[PDB]
Design a protein around this ligand. Sequence first.
Ligand code: PXP
Ligand code: PXP
Lengths: 347, 368
Amino acid sequence: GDPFFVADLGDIVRKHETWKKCLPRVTPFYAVKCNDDWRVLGTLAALGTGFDCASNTEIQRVRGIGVPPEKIIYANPCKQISHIRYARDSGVDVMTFDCVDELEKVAKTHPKAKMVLRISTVKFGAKVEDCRFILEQAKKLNIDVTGVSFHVGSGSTDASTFAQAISDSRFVFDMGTELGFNMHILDIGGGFPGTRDAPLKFEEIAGVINNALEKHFPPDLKLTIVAEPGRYYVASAFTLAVNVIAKAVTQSFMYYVNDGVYGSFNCILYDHAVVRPLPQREPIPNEKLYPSSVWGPTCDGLDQIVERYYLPEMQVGEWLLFEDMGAYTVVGTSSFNGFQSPTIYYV
Amino acid sequence: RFLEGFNTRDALCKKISGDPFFVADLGDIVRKHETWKKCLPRVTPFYAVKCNDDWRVLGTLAALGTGFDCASNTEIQRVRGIGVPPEKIIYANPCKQISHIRYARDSGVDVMTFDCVDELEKVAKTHPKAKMVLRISTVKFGAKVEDCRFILEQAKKLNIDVTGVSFHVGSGSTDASTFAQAISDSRFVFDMGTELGFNMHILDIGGGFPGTRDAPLKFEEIAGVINNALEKHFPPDLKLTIVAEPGRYYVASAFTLAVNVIAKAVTPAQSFMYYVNDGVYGSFNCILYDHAVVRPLPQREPIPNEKLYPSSVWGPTCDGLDQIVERYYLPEMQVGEWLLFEDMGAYTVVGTSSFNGFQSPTIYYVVS
Ligand code: PXP
Ligand code: PXP
């Protein structure tokens, strides 16, 4: 009675149809770090997306499935020197950076790279006020700076963050052109919601992006607008089924399932994730709900998935389901306590 | 995969000539065991493999004569695979998947733990001749002492062979008095078992013993309080065996992580940001899961009167949460140089993922 994922790949197809409708000017480069499953990456490749890779291993994974290097962006601003050499031999030329020290590595290791200055919206992002000096030094290093990127992140309450980021990008775009650079790529990053229970919808985020785009980056055959969505594509696609392996009573209950914070639910710690346990059995009308906690299978007392969510009395052998579990779930798991990661089945 | 050199800090400098790597002083583990036999001579250590399940670590411990606390089928197969008999294994997971109990049974492992009646209903159907150890509370695990009578009554009805009591204080103890109260409580439950007809002969005092120098509550003080409590409540007797489940005690100071500075960024107050090729998705997952605080230490020789700047250390990953140190005073470093993190053997190599396609570091071994 092991745990398992059900990934509906048709959900990915619908997400992309909605992307083309809402953001027709923006070519999506899927952030593979989000979910690097083969059937996910094949479905996206077939739908025609690019791919945002952050390491030599992710480049190897997408190149292995026949994706050409021009559909890959190496969007890690701080790259190990060996990793840059590897990308250069795979034909991947587009890479990000956010400081001059990164350009010193690139001038030694991959001088013909098309470099995209990532700006801040504190780990990553060159402050706008440092950007002039960065680009001046790039000219001294003979770097082909070809664009600007930013990343708003998933924690956007107000869509106005996208608008200001795009306005700031235009200011850096114009600086680049003033210094003789071939500025032709805007990369608007990720952070787009992938779930139906999101407060800031995708549809209004897109409206704010498109109005800012028409203002600051009016249509032009020279300009290519690009993005780096991760969770948007895969979040609602995966559903996790977990077996209740133990039970305890105190009214309240305590359920232990065979997957937790070391496995698929590492999203709780690493990705600010909140989840909702759903009984897989048909709900009987008017059955009472008690306040209940759910726990992973490890020793650790930190291995808790839910604190007090109102569930009906369950039994050992029954299953709980977690919807919206495809983003940053099958990628951050470990083999702690010796427990195995759930097998993925596809619809 | 072994390495030249007297001590740990010598062996690091030899190999450097740029993936991250561990250097594991297996002789540190030997000195931890010697200290254990001296400070807790009545207590047989069953090492908690979940802490560091490395092959060489397990083999070193088995040869020193320790048992092994296993929490799953995978960990049991791993210790049985290196020539450890089923008697030297305790299956100290109180909430076990039915299929995992079935696996322990067929492997010879009979001692398991439990903290409630539902767990016994499982054991009756699947492993009815298991020697069961009632884990008591010191909110995740542990039967409250007030529930223990009712639990052992139900255990009589299920014909369970209850043979002992266990507890777990945990590493977050500022006062050794938790151990003395747990041992008294353990005696109370021990007497209830004997009263109800059970053959109570095992006391299991859990883990939580410090494995580092910079721990405030010292090992020697903890062991002192435990032995006073044991002499009081569990006086020496040939039928009684006392057992513990140390994890971090044995391996915490045995591992040293060597990481490479793969990037830098300056801010002219003058601060530096270092990016290294290991982070919170790899070896420093201990920061999120284990409340770990780490000190970065340049491997290069410290030149006299050299300037120190406030510095952050970040992982290689592509997440704003992947930060190893927020603010620590280090000399100006350069891309290509190395940073060392001592005391990195406990809950590091076991909680790792390959997020962003970054590989976990290789382990190399020094044998003092
Ligand atoms: C990760 O934060 C990340 C992404 C993907 O973010 P979403 O999964 O919220 O869409 C995209 N680009 C960069 C640079 C990231 O770090
Ligand atoms: C894990 O917390 C655990 C141990 C090992 O603890 P230490 O590494 O702090 O010594 C021992 N017993 C149990 C039941 C644990 O859950």
